[PDB]
Structure 1
């Protein structure tokens, strides 16, 4: 009877109250098809009073339908817009933001335009009547910007774009310049550079966009050819990535007029605000910085007060892949050219910028000490060890006693060393054993928490300030107690925290996966060893995003990565069918592998070449127990003798 009670609605004199019990008890009930009929019926029996019943069973079923036909219910809410309540808006605005990932895009044209109504209507003079209802206004603009681009219809773009235009962006230019930066920051999504271009080129600086063989381009090589080179720009720009050109090529065409006309006082206050918007990039897209083109373009402002601690071009600049000399450029001259006003910090990020590509440590070193420290005895004892290169001897004895003796001397330099050397020595405290592991190292790093062994402050240490840096150091010390017998430490603490931390901590820190592939050789399981290893190669793929002063960057990043990862894929690939096959029938086949492993040469560098010499010896022992013996002994005697001489 109701599916007929809809046809009389195709005309428009039904009473949505004469059958409101009906518009409800059928919603439970094919199930859904029946209900949707009754939804569209309610819309012309709508513009009424009371939402007590409807609101209870609406937001329940809106999300329930991945079905798109019974999703035009979204357009239907639009008549529920005028009849509105502040907090009742909050609970219901929750489905509309969700409607961004479903396939039909029919309701998006309403998902967003209802927010348009709820944006232009809620523009109050910031009366701030409700602290909760103001969460709407911001929560609304988040959909407005997450949806500006990325949808096949370019019209969703123009219609929104033209709406960040009509009464929003000011008809002024420089003012349309202040405002745009307020809009960019919230973006935690790539692109939008194209939006800078389209925004500022169409406008030009006037309501309009342009105000003015051998017979064609010779009479007018001026007025005609300017309006046309103009658009052929911005279009060729959303297609690729390198349009960074214009923005600096706009920031002067920004900076310049702000100089000969308007007072200095305000422009200073305005640009100090810019800092704040840029600091705000380093928190929202903080470590969401693969494009690099977002990062460099901004630090390339090249203005007087561009200095920021820039600790987020430290860590998230590591994702940026960009040796930036910006933090050094101001300290040279612009910032303070006129030990107190010397940058209480901005001198140290130049370290961790010539430190993240460990080459660098030598142009780091000379600038490290005698540069800024003033310990004299600590310098000439640590410096004169980098020259000896025998620091594994000369430095550690000329270093540990500064902390163990509690500054027995006057140590009038041990007091400024406190706010410093406590961190230089922290650099040295692992530097001392370049390698060799030892239980001395595993207690070196771990000694930064409680005196008794503290596993909580370890997992904690990833959370707060610092400490996270020496994270991988403690885990190389696995190697030495990976030689020993007691497989208790680390694994008992860390393979469990990876399960608890998988949702946020483990997989975000499981970038460093070579290690990963190594503990799996304790418990006889290859599959995940391979998985996490293959993610390993294909990440290192990306760190190969650097060819300028390559030879430092590369020699490091290549010469070891592709050297461990092979001597494992080899070991894995070989051991299964090959290992099983070889062990079972031919001893000689096993030898065959050895004369591929003797003429494997080493780069001048130490470390990993030295480092993989553990790999081959666990590859040995892990198969000496899964499986003649004299031959194996000879190989051990041999392989053992090479990596000693």
Structure 2
């Protein structure tokens, strides 16, 4: 309306009121969520401080819900004109940055706390120097000290050393800096809560040092502290400050307004646990009760914050209503029945154990103490009971830090144990925990020579000397093995081996008995035989303790120990290391009887590879392991099927003795599918490796083929989609064989088999049936052209047809264009039968199951609907309907010109990795998913491929908003600038669309250009990312609620693409699923250093972001905000080496596919991949230097280093020797050079690998089809 009003400036005046009035309106309405919606009205309004006059809790307090950032919303875009450059503008507002700070304080969580922990502490250029530091604590998840030591001096000096940087320190740095410091143990209790709580405020008449405001600038923020502080205090007993002082000043702040007061304290209900109120307990839990009535009623967009918050909440709560209510009726019976029972105690501690978040994981043992207390004091109205309940309370906490892997509060609790139990096993548990606590130090690199002896100081001297023998002498002798894992492992370096500091002397001393000179060679002996010594100390108790208690432990353990030391001997040559190294694996493999009751996929992936390279044990490997999936459920093999399917085919000389055994065992144990793959697999090479081998295995082939008859029925049943790749790919394989030597016979020979089987005889009736309706129509008359010159070619097998195929291809494609008519194919495809109910042969659901135990196909793929469409592609893959047997519905996609046993492996890792997402709680705390897929590889060039919906390229919405905003249909893509950067390309390198990324000089100018161009190109499409992101995004808070998991993608993504290189992604190839509402990568066309090492396609980038990306991702500094996320990827990664070790290990160890046949693949699509493939992999290891380069590549990265090795061996200077040096570039980028550490790089590795990509220098190089330029 103010639009029609020429009056505008005065409208501004109107706003002034509007705003202000609404800011009061904040300042006045409270405990009112419908105004939570109002704040959102307010951000929907159009102005800047339109909000800002709303500070954070001013939006609303401890609960605004996630309207929380929404003010922040306009903040960055428009309110912020200053910070939008991603760096502090001293003229920017503490009322701009800060309000985010304070607000996300109630987003306090891993990511948020990581977010703000430095976040606009970039927005303060003062904060940086100490702030970036102390971030690590919360990154280490330090609620205790390592910060308090790290940052405490910042405000604590009153910035003595700090202020001298420059006049800015200001207040929010100090505000946040302080409230920072205290809030840590404010969650973590202990005395720093009392100490720092004191550091906040006088505890000298708080009540109105509290009521001191109706607008806390802070003060409500300290509000919890001392009433928080009580808790460590409430541990022992009663009679302190907050007891009466707060009990009353809530009888006065009570007289202020009751609700939100309550909402801030059931600290109110908390203290009660001391004084045994039968009454204010009653009503004031009722207040906790109506309270979370508010909570869940106040919430939407269901989230850990929306929830886990409320979860810890209701947990502790009704834990109390327990506690109370049986203080209420504990008298009613008898007197006291729990005197005879108390196991209400069991009923209390068992029911809620310790989930991922550790706030709760304290809150519990708090409550517990408060109860076991009341127990023993109500024992009067016996103690072996409640004491036993103390052991109870403690142990779960103990081991459940052993999950949390967190140092400080642990030993807080370990000392707490030495106090608490003081038993014979008080220690032994203190021990076991301390032991793991090392491995929590072993987690990081810091503590190099240190923690190792530190607790290893305490090793066998006092441990089992405290036992009875004593089941779980298992778990301790184990703990040893843990140790020598550490003491061993600190040499991936010779870190210890080069460090004889003070102790390491003593280490070598004990070493022979359980300097660096003996540690040098003979530590590994000491480590080894005190480990395995502990293994025979532990072996019977592995069987004794509990199902999957210690067997998995000791056994997977020493297994790992070995295979690691194997990897050593893969690198280094020690004959005796091979002697016991190859003596031992005999033991650990067999455990799958005991073992193989969990995934332990280490075991399963190792075991084949063992013989695969080497077998010293003729039947042993065959005896017991042959008993494996023979014995253990049919399903138990499935995860490594791909292995066997080539392994049994091309690899195995031991097939008949072993693999043939189990597989032929597991068909009658209901394995059915292996046909398809084998169908595919045994398709290429029938195994000529050995006589007997091919004989009995080929026998297997024949045995299992029957009933795979109907598979084959799916085979021919899919000549789908369009032959046009049958033809063209025939031109490519055939015409490709024209570059060979003599012996052209087999070459085009099988190509003929499957040509005049597939195509050249379309009307051939046998073909005709399996010929499709597309072929029935247009796959004939031009196939008459093709059968003639193709009959000559059928007669010749000489290279001339390279030109004739030039004709042929042009012919064979150009007359194939109009078809793909979609339910022409489908009714032809409407065979699929279902008579004698498909003749009584049970069928997968199309590749049923991911490798979790017992047959995961109880379903039959059954019918199909003719509904299908292709994504326009080089594939044009048909997306077809799988209609269900058991009343399931399963449509999917197809890949017919290509067949992927490689991306098989690809997910075959993914499943592992997110397997580790499981291994870490905090991953769950980040809700770390996996995009997956599936494939039904029946034969050589093709297999069915899974499909999933609501899923379309980001590029889509990007564009529709692009064009239909930018003019109408144009996008912006016909801008001059794109073709103009192409012009600079042509000026500094060749003229053509293939190369001209060759020459590539002027690295400073490289930066110059790619900046200049890049930015004027790329800003508006960011508005589209956020924008169509909006037309997706229903509610304002839903927006970034979305980019939670969206970013979660781009992170986990970029991780994967370091795990191996990116291809099969333009920018589009990641595609939103609307329910998660975020793109996924399903697309994998490339890996490792080969692809990038292609002179056509050099790519240094460890991943691909773009300008618009980071823009969307925020006016942040998502640098951090996804950075440390990446870290968690790594802190994950550093958990167990052997995982991916085996993964990529046997992974690249196996294939003849992934190189020459993947040469064939890159062929099968990649254009400049044309000659690259063959003349590339020749005389070169995708294997063993890739073996090591990848194995190290795990460990640390001085800047994409082993790639630089690869492309280094590659050619030539102008692209490479130029940029790999120019990867190191100006003091602009010089960080990228100097920052790296060959010795150790991790959170680093992140740091660089992130904006390695940011480098316009790196950017304008890579390629256009990836459009960082756009």
- TM-score (normalised: structure 1): 0.54
Q: Structure 1 CA distance, aligned partners of 2:298 and 2:257? A: 28
User: 2:366 corresponds to which residue?
Assistant: 614
User: 2:134 corresponds to which residue?
Assistant: 382
Q: Structure 2 CA distance, aligned partners of 1:456 and 1:578? A: 36
| Cα shift at 1:569 | 1.2
- Residues 82-161 of structure 1: matches in 2 within 5 Å? none
- Residues 447-462 of structure 1: matches in 2 within 5 Å? 447-449=199-201, 453=204, 455=206, 458-462=209-213
User: 1:635 corresponds to which residue?
Assistant: 389
CA contact (8 A) 2:354 2:361 kept: yes
Report the 3-state secondary structure (helix = DSSP H, G, I; strand = E; otherwise coil) of the residue aligned with 2:225: helix
User: 1:298 corresponds to which residue?
Assistant: 42
| Cα shift at 1:606 | 0.2
Q: Structure 1 CA distance, aligned partners of 2:128 and 2:116? A: 18
User: 2:241 corresponds to which residue?
Assistant: 489
Match of 2:58 among 301, 314, 317: 314
- Indicate whether 1:419 and 2:163 are aligned: no
| Cα shift at 1:605 | 0.6
- Residues 40-55 of structure 1: matches in 2 within 5 Å? none
More deviation in 491-500 or 616-625?
A: 491-500
- Residues 436-455 of structure 1: matches in 2 within 5 Å? 436-449=188-201, 453=204, 455=206
- Residues 103-502 of structure 1: matches in 2 within 5 Å? 254-258=1-5, 262=6, 264-285=8-29, 288=32, 290-303=34-47, 306-311=50-55, 314-316=58-60, 320-335=64-79, 337=81, 339-359=89-109, 360-365=112-117, 367-390=119-142, 392-409=144-161, 411-413=163-165, 415-433=167-185, 435-449=187-201, 453=204, 455=206, 458-463=209-214, 465-485=217-237, 487-502=239-254
Q: Deviations over 1:471-498 (max 9, x none)?
A: 0122121012212345132213222333
Q: Deviations over 1:38-82 (max 9, x none)?
A: xxxxxxxxxxxxxxxxxxxxxxxxxxxxxxxxxxxxxxxxxxxxx
CA contact (8 A) 1:559 1:603 kept: no
Q: Structure 2 CA distance, aligned partners of 1:410 and 1:593? A: 52
- TM-score (normalised: structure 2): 0.28
What runs of 5+ residues in structure 2 fail to find an aligned partner? 83-88, 400-1270
CA contact (8 A) 1:430 1:444 kept: yes
- Residues 501-580 of structure 1: matches in 2 within 5 Å? 501-504=253-256, 509-545=261-297, 549-580=301-332
1:559 to 1:422, Cα distance in 2 relative to 1, 3 A: same
1:608 to 1:303, Cα distance in 2 relative to 1, 3 A: same
Q: Deviations over 1:568-592 (max 9, x none)?
A: 1111222322455256456443235
Aligned residues: 388
Report the 3-state secondary structure (helix = DSSP H, G, I; strand = E; otherwise coil) of the residue aligned with 1:370: helix
Q: Structure 2 CA distance, aligned partners of 1:504 and 1:306? A: 30
User: 1:178 corresponds to which residue?
Assistant: none
1:534 to 1:284, Cα distance in 2 relative to 1, 3 A: closer
Higher relative contact order (CA 8 A, sep 6+): 2
Report the 3-state secondary structure (helix = DSSP H, G, I; strand = E; otherwise coil) of the residue aligned with 1:257: coil
1:325 to 1:439, Cα distance in 2 relative to 1, 3 A: closer
Q: Structure 2 CA distance, aligned partners of 1:308 and 1:298? A: 11
Match of 1:590 among 338, 342, 349: 342
| Cα shift at 1:444 | 1.1
Report the 3-state secondary structure (helix = DSSP H, G, I; strand = E; otherwise coil) of the residue aligned with 1:520: helix
| Cα shift at 1:640 | 3.6
Q: Structure 2 CA distance, aligned partners of 1:553 and 1:354? A: 11
| Cα shift at 1:346 | 1.8
Q: Structure 2 CA distance, aligned partners of 1:579 and 1:343? A: 60
1:387 to 1:453, Cα distance in 2 relative to 1, 3 A: same
CA contact (8 A) 2:312 2:360 kept: yes
1:508 to 1:283, Cα distance in 2 relative to 1, 3 A: closer
Q: Structure 1 CA distance, aligned partners of 2:142 and 2:260? A: 37
Q: Structure 2 CA distance, aligned partners of 1:280 and 1:460? A: 19
Q: Structure 1 CA distance, aligned partners of 2:245 and 2:19? A: 42
What runs of 5+ residues in structure 1 fail to find an aligned partner? 1-253
1:357 to 1:456, Cα distance in 2 relative to 1, 3 A: closer
Q: Deviations over 1:2-40 (max 9, x none)?
A: xxxxxxxxxxxxxxxxxxxxxxxxxxxxxxxxxxxxxxx
Q: Structure 2 CA distance, aligned partners of 1:570 and 1:632? A: 17
Report the 3-state secondary structure (helix = DSSP H, G, I; strand = E; otherwise coil) of the residue aligned with 1:607: helix
Q: Structure 2 CA distance, aligned partners of 1:319 and 1:391? A: 22
Q: Structure 2 CA distance, aligned partners of 1:409 and 1:295? A: 41
Q: Structure 1 CA distance, aligned partners of 2:356 and 2:333? A: 37
1:315 to 1:273, Cα distance in 2 relative to 1, 3 A: closer
CA contact (8 A) 2:59 2:68 kept: no
Q: Structure 2 CA distance, aligned partners of 1:483 and 1:317? A: 29
CA contact (8 A) 1:603 1:609 kept: yes
CA contact (8 A) 1:546 1:554 kept: no
Q: Structure 2 CA distance, aligned partners of 1:290 and 1:318? A: 16
User: 1:625 corresponds to which residue?
Assistant: 377
| Cα shift at 1:468 | 1.4
Report the 3-state secondary structure (helix = DSSP H, G, I; strand = E; otherwise coil) of the residue aligned with 1:480: helix
Q: Structure 2 CA distance, aligned partners of 1:564 and 1:351? A: 28
Q: Deviations over 1:328-349 (max 9, x none)?
A: 3444343453734322412211
1:501 to 1:263, Cα distance in 2 relative to 1, 3 A: closer
The Cα RMSD (Å) is 3.3
| Cα shift at 1:604 | 0.5
CA contact (8 A) 1:323 1:353 kept: no
1:591 to 1:341, Cα distance in 2 relative to 1, 3 A: closer
Q: Deviations over 1:375-401 (max 9, x none)?
A: 332123212323332463321112122
